[PDB]
């Protein structure tokens, strides 16, 4: 089934360029079975999952290797990530402006 699905997809490809088909075939063709699989969910976003019996071969704390689709662009997520990085860095000096072009505008240029 995996080979047939891959062959069918690659001639009428997806915007993913059939990546899930490729990895599915690669993991099926292993002798002892797939190490990495795609979790089946009622939740909207699917996740990549790792089998437990091969967890000692991979550098992971858990079996969940994250979502199988990239994040969606969001001002709020960007703000969150930037705040987290600032907190982790803890650098006194961020945002300090020693000289600003004198202007009625708050941010000259930008």
């Amino acid at each position: 089934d995996e080979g047939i699905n891959l062959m069918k997809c690659t001639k009428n490809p997806d915007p993913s360029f059939c990546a899930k088909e490729f990895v599915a075939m690669r993991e099926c063709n292993r002798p002892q079975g797939p190490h990495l699989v795609l979790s089946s969910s009622p939740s909207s976003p699917p996740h990549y999952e790792l089998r437990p019996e091969v967890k000692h071969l991979y550098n992971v704390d858990s079996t969940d290797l994250g979502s199988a689709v990239a994040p969606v662009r969001s001002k709020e997520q960007l703000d969150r990530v930037a705040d987290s990085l600032k907190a982790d860095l803890n650098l006194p000096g961020y945002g300090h402006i020693p000289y600003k072009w004198e202007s009625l505008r708050p941010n000259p240029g930008a």
Binding site: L91, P92, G93, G95, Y99, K100, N107, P108, A110
Partner: protein, 145 residues
């Protein structure tokens, strides 16, 4: 006037010493490519080391230091538009890391200035009772004879 000059003698498009000839020469060099901007393959030849470019970058990034982003733009212009897999020599690598270090220090220590990072500003914060003393003499190192 320009039109009639074209049919007058010694007054064709850019030939002659008339103002019509001067104007046509200006239009000709404009129509040419020599004054166009350079391509991305050729930006790190002159433009990324230019005073206009540096001043504009500093101006439109008010409180920041764009040396590092300029280094990365050079890397881009050489890698992604000229085809060089190894754009940076050892000197350029050192310069990149120097600018990275300066960024780290500027964000770590508030108000750091020239002797430790290349930066000068006037409105500084001083304690209030500023003492002035002579430096100690340079340390006597042992030497033969």
């Amino acid at each position: 006037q320009f039109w009639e000059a074209q049919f007058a003698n010694r007054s064709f498009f850019f030939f002659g010493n008339a103002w019509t000839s001067a104007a046509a020469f200006a239009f000709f060099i404009w129509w040419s490519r020599v004054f166009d901007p350079p391509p991305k393959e050729r930006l790190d030849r002159y433009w990324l080391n230019s005073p206009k470019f540096r001043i504009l970058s500093a101006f439109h990034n008010p409180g920041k230091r764009p040396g590092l982003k300029i280094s990365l733009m050079t890397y881009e212009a050489r890698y992604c538009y000229r085809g060089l897999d190894h754009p940076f020599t050892l000197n350029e690598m050192k310069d990149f890391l120097f600018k990275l270090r300066e960024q780290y220090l500027v964000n770590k220590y508030e108000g750091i200035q020239f002797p430790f990072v290349f930066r000068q500003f006037n409105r500084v914060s001083t304690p209030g009772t500023l003492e002035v003393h002579t430096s100690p003499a340079l340390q006597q190192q042992p030497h033969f004879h």
